[PDB]
């Protein structure tokens, strides 16, 4: 139900080995760690959760873009790219969170499908 | 030293009356809110800080995109758009944070001079 | 070797049934029709060419974004989204041309892989 | 009535000295070039046309992105970025064509007032 895809707009390639941390907001308001992983050679990260665990809630996906650029010798603008959204408010959906990275810019898009 | 500009990709216009909150990261790793405003008729927000107060640090700019889309009667995906950056790491700079908004996508860019 | 993917940034979905026309620039400078098709239910168009036909050259991918919006009742800004690029200049590559559509904006990205 | 603004997503700056050519579609479906310029130190190009000459029609704005990246020593994907639009269909408007450039990606947006 949740996939993250990261692309590099400088090289026109997948952004490989990008760390991603996902959090869910608890009923106390705090950000509870929910899942993490790193992007594969295709720039994708699958397997973060399951339909049953991925309940309604407010989720945050934090993509460690700074470390990605630093490893390429670049000092980028952003510390990270953070995507915050309410999920499954009108029933279960599949979410693809895509990010397109440049040193001084990022774009993010959600593709939401009803399986 | 800090300006925010917001555009609406649906209407082809400045995004007017968008709330923007700015925070500085505190020593305890919490976000200390210290400036806010809303975008003008040109989609711009000026006057958030001054040269003397805008010292090196990590800053967060939160743009209340959800409220903007709700006011237009359009279903949005994100809660907000957040920009987090280390400022002034090599000297004081002028920063323009530009955001281009769609209901299920946004982009943000920094123009640093 | 050539795939086109189109997404709708208003609904967070694939842009389905989008017409795409591909042209190649001839040695006379004119744009020669090369391939066409329409995006599937996943927003993707595959099967446009083959490794052997997709020689070095300058290609244009024209995505009929206006008709897509018009069918949704919208009068968009752009007539189309046109992506023009030199292909295979340093040997055969696979190209994914992605476009992200809004009524008054579009983004386009190339992912280029070496198989 | 027509301004072009170009930003560089790699450097976090205006894209300076970028060539821009504007064309109007002719009755024979050919593109008739009629204005050009290059972006200023602020990434902007003003003064392309006037209210009287900018009549309804289909216009193309071609931004020479390839030359810009070559001048920076960066390998680019696209030949150029092209924006094609019908102008003034509902009255005269002011158009700002904004482009945000990366070597393998670009976005373009219209701000129409
Ligand atoms: N001014 C501006 C233009 C585009 Cl096309 C994208 C972004 Cl983030 C800003």
Author numbering:
A (entry chain A), C (entry chain A): 11 to 125
B (entry chain B), D (entry chain B): 11 to 123
List passages from the publication reporting this PDB structure:
Transthyretin (TTR) is a homotetrameric plasma protein (also present in cerebrospinal fluid) with two thyroxine binding sites. There are two structurally identical thyroxine binding sites in between the dimer-dimer interface with a line of 2-fold symmetry running across the binding channel (red line). Binding of thyroxine or other ligands could stabilise the TTR tetramer by forming non-covalent bonds to each monomer, effectively “securing” them in position.
12 of the 15 titrated hits alongside 3,5-Dichloroaniline (DIA) and N-Phenylanthranilic Acid (NPA) were selected for co-crystallisation with TTR. However, when fragments are optimised into part of a lead compound, they do not seem to change the way they bind to the target. This is illustrated by the superposition of DIA and NPA structure to that of a previously characterised TTR ligand 2-(3,5-dichloro-4-hydroxyphenylamino)benzoic acid (DHB), their counterpart atomic positions accurately matched. The corresponding atomic coordinates between these three compounds matched precisely. The structures of DIA and NPA in complex with TTR have correctly predicted the atomic position of DHB. Retrospectively and elegantly, these three crystal structures have underlined the feasibility of fragment merging in drug design.
